[PDB]
Structure 1
Amino acid sequence: IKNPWEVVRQSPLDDRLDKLDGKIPRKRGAMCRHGPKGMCDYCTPLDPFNPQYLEEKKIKYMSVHAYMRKINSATNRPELGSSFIPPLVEPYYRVKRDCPSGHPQWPEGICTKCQPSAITLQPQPFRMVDHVEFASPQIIDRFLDAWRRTGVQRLGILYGRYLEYDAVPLGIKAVVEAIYEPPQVDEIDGITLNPWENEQEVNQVAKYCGLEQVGVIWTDLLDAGKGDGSVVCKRHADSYFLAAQEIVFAARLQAQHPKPSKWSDTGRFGSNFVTCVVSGNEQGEISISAYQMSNDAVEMVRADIIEPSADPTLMLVREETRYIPEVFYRKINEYGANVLENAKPAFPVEYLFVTLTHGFPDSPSPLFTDNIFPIENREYVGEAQEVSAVAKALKVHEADAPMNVSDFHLLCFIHQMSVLSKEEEALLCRVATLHDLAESFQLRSTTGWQTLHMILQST
């Protein structure tokens, strides 16, 4: 029937990027001997994956689209149809499903044709997402307020959207518009997550805003003790940048957020879920570091093959409900040759993640402009969400004031109140994100809006 790569719906971003070759144009050079409109082998456009170009621009990884261009013939496209061969294969390091060999299924039998092949951990040369752009520093500042006033760490879920990142060939960036802080118990050196009961409701609200979960963020901050805001630099070469347990956590998260792809044999390939860590840099400044767990790491966590060791820089391969194949990791000796080492019983974590760049936009134009509502799950800091906070934010007794509803947490709380219908709530979120005066007026005319205001006036 229809294959997986035929029925999956990609994002508009992926649809746009599929049509680009990403070739980097070039001008005449010192070795070119032709006119301003001729061409030779020294001025031909470069591939998006040209190693020399990426090295020259200090680009550590090529975009996943450039990687696809590299490994795939340009004629092989889904448009061909039945003759299309998806070039992307998502790692599968588990026993194969529905083995027609004769032996019983995995837990009771196994032949050489259904056992997984030997794993070879090499550094991933591509990254699904290339950049993490925060729409405004106020987002991170409001997030870190939790730690500033408590001294304990904090975790949040990044809500936003994916866009083209032009600074790198065929790049992609996650634009973060808000940080939702889910239920948790925070300590000076750890975070325990509690059941996120309303995750689907928050997802619905974000969808009304044209947003989605794009990653996770957490803090590893510790005041240096100089009364100047400086923090301790605890993540560095001589320690770690991501702990094995953190890598497993982020890998599980990525596995739960697969990216649909019309170029994969299974319709999905990799994940756009990014991971951000706020901590001290070599200058004692609060800074961000963006990462993504490799697809091999995600598959190994999917296969329950690895687990954290007592050393945060080392990952254990679990011993013999699961199958442990050969696991090597690749190194280079002093002679320059490639060497395969046995990753068992423990191997370095450096092979399990890739690094992303991050920043704020030139001139921020964020979707959510108003900070007028307490953030969720902050009772432990005396910050509680109440209907009175809604009445205050909506300035319900000051009829002469302008509408200010551009706050994601306010939108989530209002969704919780369950007063506006789906159409009314969609209009509210559209007004919050796009700020169209005519649509604000239209919202003020709705029956749900007036019901909400009558409710709010009686508190």
Structure 2
Amino acid sequence: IKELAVDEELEKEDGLIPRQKSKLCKHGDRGMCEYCSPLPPWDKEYHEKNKIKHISFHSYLKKLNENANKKENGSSYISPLSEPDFRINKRCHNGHEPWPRGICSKCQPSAITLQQQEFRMVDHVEFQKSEIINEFIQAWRYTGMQRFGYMYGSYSKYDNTPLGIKAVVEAIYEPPQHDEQDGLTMDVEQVKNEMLQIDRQAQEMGLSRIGLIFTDLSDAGAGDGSVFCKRHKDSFFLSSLEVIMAARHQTRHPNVSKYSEQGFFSSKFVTCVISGNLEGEIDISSYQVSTEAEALVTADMISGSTFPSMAYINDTTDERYVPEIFYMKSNEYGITVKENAKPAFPVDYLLVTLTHGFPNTDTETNSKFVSSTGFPWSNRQAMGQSQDYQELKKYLFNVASSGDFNLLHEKISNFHLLLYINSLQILSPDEWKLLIESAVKNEWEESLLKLVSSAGWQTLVMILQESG
């Protein structure tokens, strides 16, 4: 099987950390005893020294390869990187062949200790431009209600975190949803039918749906104060209703891995939320879900509770056997061992954090999508920017009826403009594929003149001039 091009590059590099000679070393200069030996990239002591709170899963893959492959014979190639299962094997390899009549300890799911995950799949989410997500908050500034979107992007290496993958996003697509002041809830059938055609155009453009965003602002008084502070240390970090939508999105998009026995493991999916800081701004934060316990129990046992920090655990009806969930908390006198014989266990423990950021404006490798970021989006029907062909006379117009190719190609690289053109499918699919590849790639000057000489682009500007 074949993995991603980014995932195979992190596997080949060892990522060792070099050290220097010290006063504690008693050996010679041409050697190393223990104090200047090469440090492994999975040691968590070096991680918390530089305030890195997770061990960068590609290095966690290396720390399990040392346990799988040894100096001894072995002759196995097991590679035990699989999803730990809480479901019940029906055959059970014993005399209690039905679960209605019989269950023993080798098939019973053990009591969940609630230990936090030490490794994250995505180590650092990054963005492309501050003007891209400024249009997303501007949707709230016009209708006053919450929004929703899906992030399309790619992946590359990250040199800050040892053996880490960074998440790059390029554009944000919004599905048609019904907004509300308190929260939001849309139909999953019309979104999945709409997201199927966007994945078609994302393949030729080199994009993949790897993220989503949802807003939560609660403006205070619209004067000096920006927003309220809903999510803090004493309150919930992520609501339990949005854990369900984050869990189903990770199971729909698996990550291919040759080390896993099933063929897919350790999904690379980000969930970002606009919530605001403690003091005064609308700074965002992102956390992703845990694979070890939460990713498998969401198929059978997650039920909604009235508290945003916790989630209710329901009962067993003849196939849905669940084990007891335990966690430690302080009582009125001291700190005690596991107490939970009670439902509504918290879900903030099962989240691992990420580091969001925006790159510097002075230099970058590329940006690939900065045309205007002011074009009316596809499914923004709550706002007034959902126009017909009247907008195409205002937006591009083949500027001033005779456009220069340095000023014409800079507008054609928009994500939602190219996704609006092919829906009319005036051009051929072969000429459309070279149209979107010219706008997204470099050395575009020889191929842009091929587009203007084609009869399909001439019919597009002729059918636009007669219409309003």
- Pairwise same-fold verdict (TM > 0.5): yes
Give the AA of the match of 2:205. C
Indicate if the aligned counterparts of 2:68 and 2:77 stay in contact, CA closer than 8 A. Answer: no
Equivalent AA in structure 2 for residue 346 of structure 1? A
Question: Cα offset for 1:21?
Answer: 2.0
Whole-angstrom CA distance in 2 between matches of 1:445 and 1:273: 42
1:263 matches 2:270: no
Counterpart CA distance in 2 for 1:350 and 1:279 is 16
CA distance in 1, matches of 2:202, 2:336: 47
Q: Give the 3 Å change call, closer, same or farther, for CA 454–61 of structure 1 in structure 2.
A: same
Is residue 2:198 matched to residue 1:202?
yes
Distance 1:392 1:29, change over 3 A: farther
Partner of 2:397: 395
How far did residue 447 of structure 1 move?
A: 4.3
| Structure 2 match to 1:91 | 84
8 A Cα contact 1:328 1:340, kept in partner: no
How far apart are the structure 1 equivalents of 2:221 and 2:24? 57
User: Against the structure 1 CA distance between its residues 243 and 420, is the aligned structure 2 distance closer, same or farther, given a 3 Å change threshold?
Assistant: same
Matched, 1:301 2:302: no
1:26 maps to 19
CA distance in 2, matches of 1:373, 1:67: 43
In 1, Cα distance between equivalents of 2:101 and 2:427: 56
2:455 equivalent to 1:455: no
On the 8 A contact 1:86/1:262 being kept in 2, the answer is no
Q: Distance in 2 between the 1:96 and 1:325 partners?
A: 13
Q: 1:160 aligns with which of 153, 156, 161?
A: 153
1:425 aligns with 2:427: no
Note closer, same or farther for the CA distance 1:51–1:387 as it changes in structure 2 (3 Å cut).
same
Tell me how far apart the structure 2 counterparts of residues 210 and 236 of structure 1 sit (CA, whole Å).
37
- Among 28, 37, 48, the alignment partner of 2:41 is 48
Q: Percent identity?
A: 47
| Amino acid paired to 2:122 | V
CA distance in 1, matches of 2:67, 2:439: 42
- Once residues 166 and 369 of structure 1 are traced to their aligned partners in structure 2, the CA distance between those partners, rounded to angstroms, is 25
Equivalent residue of 2:348, what SS?
Answer: helix
What per-residue deviation string (whole Å, max 9, x for no partner) do you get for residues 204-228 of structure 1?
2222221101111111112232535
Change (3 A) 1:143 1:43: same
Residues 109 and 323, structure 2, Cα contact 8 Å, conserved in 1: no
The equivalent residue for 1:438 is 446
Q: Which runs of 5+ in 1 are unaligned?
A: 1-6
Once the two structures are TM-superposed, the CA of residue 130 in structure 1 deviates from its matched residue by: 0.8
What residue identity is the alignment partner of 1:317? I
Alignment-derived partner of residue 358 in structure 2: 360
Supply the distance in 1 between the matched residues of 2:455 and 2:98 (Cα, whole angstroms): 59
Q: C-alpha separation between the residues in 2 aligned to 1:217 and 1:259? A: 20
Higher deviation after alignment, 244-253 or 188-197 = 188-197
Query: Which SS does the other structure have where 1:48 is aligned?
Result: coil
Deviation string, structure 1 residues 185-234 (Cα, Å, up to 9, x no partner): 12222122232132111112222221101111111112232535622111
TM-score by length of 1: 0.88
Give deviations 1:93-121, integer Å, cap 9, x for gaps.
22337767688777x67654655444332
CA distance in 2, matches of 1:232, 1:188: 15
Moved more, 32-41 or 61-70: 32-41
Number of residue pairs the alignment of both structures matches: 448
How far is the alpha carbon of 1:87 from its aligned partner? 2.3
CA distance in 1, matches of 2:23, 2:341: 48
Alpha-carbon distance, 1:340 to partner: 4.3
Equivalent residue for 2:215, pick from 219, 242, 245: 219
**How big is the shift at 1:299?**
0.9
1:345-384 matched pairs, under 5 angstroms: 345-362=343-360, 363-364=363-364, 365-371=366-372, 372-384=374-386
Structure 2 unaligned segments of length 5 or more: list them: none
Q: Which has the larger radius of gyration?
A: 2
Residue 448 of structure 1 deviates from its aligned partner by 3.7
Which of 448-457 and 235-244 deviates more? 448-457
CA distance in 1, matches of 2:335, 2:37: 33
Root-mean-square deviation over aligned CA pairs: 2.9
CA change 1:51–1:383 in 2 (3 A) is same
Q: 1:142 maps to which residue?
A: 135
Q: Is the 8 A contact 1:161 1:175 kept in 2?
A: yes
**Given the superposition, is the C-alpha separation of residues 76 and 389 from structure 1 closer, same or farther in structure 2, using an over 3 Å criterion?**
farther
Structure 1 segment 118-197 matched on structure 2, within 5 A = 118-194=111-187, 195-196=190-191, 197=193
Higher deviation after alignment, 449-458 or 136-145: 449-458
Of the three residues 54, 60, 82, the one matched with 1:61 is 54
1:249-328 aligned within 5 A? 249-295=245-291, 296-302=293-299, 304-320=300-316, 322-328=319-325
Report the 3-state secondary structure (helix = DSSP H, G, I; strand = E; otherwise coil) of the residue aligned with 2:85. Answer: coil
TM-superposition CA deviations, 1:274-311 (whole Å, max 9, x none): 00011111122111111111112121112x21222101
Amino acid of the structure 1 residue aligned with 2:18: P
Q: Which SS does the other structure have where 2:326 is aligned?
A: strand
Kept after mapping to 2: 8 A contact 1:318/1:324: no
| Counterpart residue identity of residue 173, structure 1 | K
- Return closer, same or farther for 1:88/1:340 CA change in 2, 3 Å cut-off: farther
CA separation of 1:102 and 1:450: change in aligned 2, threshold 3 A: farther
CA-to-partner distance for each residue in 1:301-324, whole Å, 9 max, x for gaps? 12x212221011111111127413
TM-score by length of 2: 0.87
Show CA shifts across 1:161-195 (max 9, x none): 11112211111111011111111112222122232
> In 2, are the aligned partners of 1:124 and 1:354 still within 8 Å (CA)?
yes
Alignment-mate amino acid for residue 182 of structure 2: D
Q: Cα offset for 1:20? A: 1.9
Amino acid at match of 1:230: S
1:26 maps to a residue whose letter is R
SS at match of 1:328: coil
Q: Hey, what's the Cα distance between the residues in 2 that align with 1:35 and 1:185?
A: 71
- For 2:141 and 2:242, locate their aligned partners in 1 and report how far apart those are by CA, in whole Å: 23
